[PDB]
Amino acid sequence: QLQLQESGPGLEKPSETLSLTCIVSGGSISSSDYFWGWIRQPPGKGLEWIGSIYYSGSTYYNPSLKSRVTTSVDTSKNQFSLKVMSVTAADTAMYYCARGGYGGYESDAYDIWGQGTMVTVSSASTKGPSVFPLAPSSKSTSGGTAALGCLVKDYFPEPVTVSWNSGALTSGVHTFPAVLQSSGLYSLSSVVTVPSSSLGTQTYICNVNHKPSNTKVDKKVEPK
Amino acid sequence: IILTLSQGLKKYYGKILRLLQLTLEEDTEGLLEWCKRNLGLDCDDTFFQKRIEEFFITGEGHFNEVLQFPFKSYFAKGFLSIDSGYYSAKCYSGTSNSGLQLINITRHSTRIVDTPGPKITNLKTINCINLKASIFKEHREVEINVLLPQVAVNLSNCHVVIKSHVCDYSLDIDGAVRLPHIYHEGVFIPGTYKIVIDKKNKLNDRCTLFTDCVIKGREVRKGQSVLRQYKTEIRIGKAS
Amino acid sequence: SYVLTQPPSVSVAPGQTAKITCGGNNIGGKSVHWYQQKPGQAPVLVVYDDSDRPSGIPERFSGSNSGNTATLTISRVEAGDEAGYFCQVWDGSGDQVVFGGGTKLTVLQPKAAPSVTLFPPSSEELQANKATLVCLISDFYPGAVTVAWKADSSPVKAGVETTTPSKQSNNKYAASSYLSLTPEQWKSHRSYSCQVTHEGSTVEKTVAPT
Ligand SMILES: *[C@@H]1O[C@H](CO)[C@@H](O[C@@H]2O[C@H](CO)[C@@H](O)[C@H](O)[C@H]2NC(C)=O)[C@H](O)[C@H]1NC(C)=O
Ligand SMILES: *[C@@H]1O[C@H](CO)[C@@H](O[C@@H]2O[C@H](CO)[C@@H](O)[C@H](O)[C@H]2NC(C)=O)[C@H](O)[C@H]1NC(C)=O
């Protein structure tokens, strides 16, 4: 199937240019009945259309942003891209790419979306997290089960993703939304509920990934 | 003052061209008498609508020069040269038409939603269902056949001749193509018309058509193809 | 600049019918699309062209559009329908995409007590000359908890960070609180506690430097 994927820097400095790329896969961007658009969503706010571009190069911009955004399309690489000039904190947002009907044949609704990529505008440098284990206490949750976790401490910017045992453990996993500390650094905890009888036979390793800093950390969580 | 047969017929036609909405001006001073003296009647607006309606639709055989079915020489089929001196149109009677080549525009309009689409449309690649183009490279002329006249076509630095089964006339003014309006228990315009653009005329060097490109969508709803449209330019002149 | 007007929110009991309007001048002349967006996820097209559904969208979703108002209707509402809903049109005059401001649909939910887990500092953090207490609160409705930290029995008045309660995937709420201490503060007191109050009921968890 046709899948869209955003690619972004995660972090951009004030008064610099943010550049995002969407890779189209499973089909050609050179579609005569569709064009390719960027929609963003600042924290807590609604959806805002930035612009859309046809494979032939014709661009359609939001009038509020036309003076500082531009879109391109590269048909050979099967991607289109977005540039936002002189960014400030007002440009910190989730950025989405999406496909919409163009030219009358198909509906102009945006049927296929990317996953969204998170861009934060800050003068601060990226910072990977320090990961510490949250050890079980024989039966942290009731009797049969127990709770263990990973403290993902003092990173910037969002997001981090956390998996357990390289994805082999998905039941009972709860990754909590991060807290924003007054230092501007982020912190979160991932906790997983496992049976108590397994605390001495199963190794539990959490996997922390922080794309903006290119940090990947594995932490074994053993019973103290 | 008095007008002879010659001057009064021009103003008589001038009023018809105004009511047809082909002109926005008229010289009708002296006309009211002229109809009392040469026609023995009061030619108010109601009278003139009856003449337009009877000439283009509800014919009664043979018509004269003043659109009744002096001026005792009644013709047959074909055309009156409704010429006011200021402007003229070659208009055809409904007796010379096989059926009703008019459409009723007071009747409801099929819904056409707007959509994103190409801002420039090439004259050789017109996928709009309301427009059909013929390029005559041998004669250096273009004929645009408008199939949905209710969708406006706007001229931009164009000097064209409009041809239809109702009237034939020249257009030289920017904006939406003016079409003949006839009242017959509702408003009627031609069902199709033709825009003839002579590219051998220097006045058409930058001739551009602005219109809504209507497109049949893939979806069929209520047993019909849904319609979408986008604004587009068709560049016809050399340096457009 | 064509303007779309959506109500900020709408509540519905399970099984009832929800309606979300999108106002605009002569919006009936435009094709209205609806997107559903759940917390932390990309939007999803649920209705297009006023009233058509993409494949996989349940029949309970239905649309209409005429005059100055378009309406999204969700019948026999389920918990999983809780989301933000956005209307959207292409404005042919301004040559732009316009999104409504979005409508938060909530589905009425029973009251739910929080689960609280409290973790002491790890040996590795203690070996790094730092110490953090972690209080994890989850599965509570409504989304309002009081969090209180206690050193022994006395209230802590420094080094606390607490998240705003955010909606989990099951539409209950979760929140975290963190107490920062020095390793010496951690070992000097006999215990620390996290006190969570929700709708008059308090849960207390305690950890010890042991
Ligand atoms: C042109 O179309 C209009 C419809 O817009 C027709 O007028 C309607 O005629 C029917 C039948 O007589 C009436 O029931 C409606 O009340 C009329 N509506 C209006 C607004 O007048 C009109 O008759 C048509 N003219 C034709 C077909 O010659
Ligand atoms: C062609 O011209 C017509 C009329 O000159 C345009 O229609 C008008 O557009 C303005 C601006 O949107 C409106 O305020 C008027 O009410 C419209 N009038 C009518 C009768 O529709 C039309 O938009 C033009 N088409 C193109 C493609 O430029």
Strand content of chain C: over 45%
Oligomer: heterotrimer
* CATH hierarchy: architecture of the largest domain in chain C: Sandwich
Radius of gyration of chain C: 24 Å
Largest interface: A-C, 45 and 46 residues
Number of helices of chain C: 2
Please name the CATH topology of the largest domain in chain A: Immunoglobulin-like
Strand count, sense and barrel status of the largest sheet of chain A are: 7 strands, mixed
- In the CATH hierarchy, the third-tier topology of the largest domain in chain C is known as Immunoglobulin-like
Share of helical residues of chain C: under 10%
Largest sheet data of chain C: 6 strands, mixed
Percentage of helical residues of chain A?
A: under 10%
Tell how many strands the DSSP assignment of chain A holds.
Answer: 19
Write down the CATH class of the largest domain in chain C.
Mainly Beta
Instruction: Give the CATH H-level superfamily of the largest domain in chain C.
Output: Immunoglobulins
CATH architecture identity of the largest domain in chain A: Sandwich
User: What string, H for helix and E for strand, traces the elements of chain A in order?
Assistant: EEEEEEEEEEEEEEEEEEE
**What fraction of the residues of chain A are assigned to beta strands by DSSP?**
over 45%
Secondary-structure element series of chain C = EEEEEEEEEEHEEEEEEHEE
Structural class of chain A: mainly beta
PDB class: viral protein/immune system
Keywords: cchfv, GP38, Antibody, Immunology, viral protein, VIRAL PROTEIN-IMMUNE SYSTEM complex
Assembly: trimeric
Entry title: CCHFV GP38 bound to ADI-46143 Fab
Describe the structure.
The complex is a heterotrimer of chains A (224), B (240) and C (210). With 224 residues, chain A is mostly beta strands. Helix content of chain A is 0%, strand content 49%. Chain A has no helices and 19 strands. Chain B has 240 residues and is α+β, with helices and mostly antiparallel strands. Chain B folds into two domains: 5-96, no CATH class; 113-235, no CATH class. Chain B has helices at residues 5-19, 31-38, 45-56, and strands at residues 79-83, 88-92, 102-104, 113-114, 120-121, 131-136, 141-146, 153-156, 160-163, 167-171, 175-176, 182-183, 187-190, 193-198, 208-221, 224-235. In chain B, a hairpin with a 3-residue loop joins strand 9 (160-163) and strand 10. Chain B is globular, with a radius of gyration of 20 Å. At the A-C interface, strand 5, strand 10, strand 12, strand 13 and strand 17 of A face strand 3, strand 7, strand 8, strand 10 and helix 1 of C. A molecule of 2 linked components (NAG-NAG) binds at residues 152, 154, 175-176, 210-212, 231 of chain B.
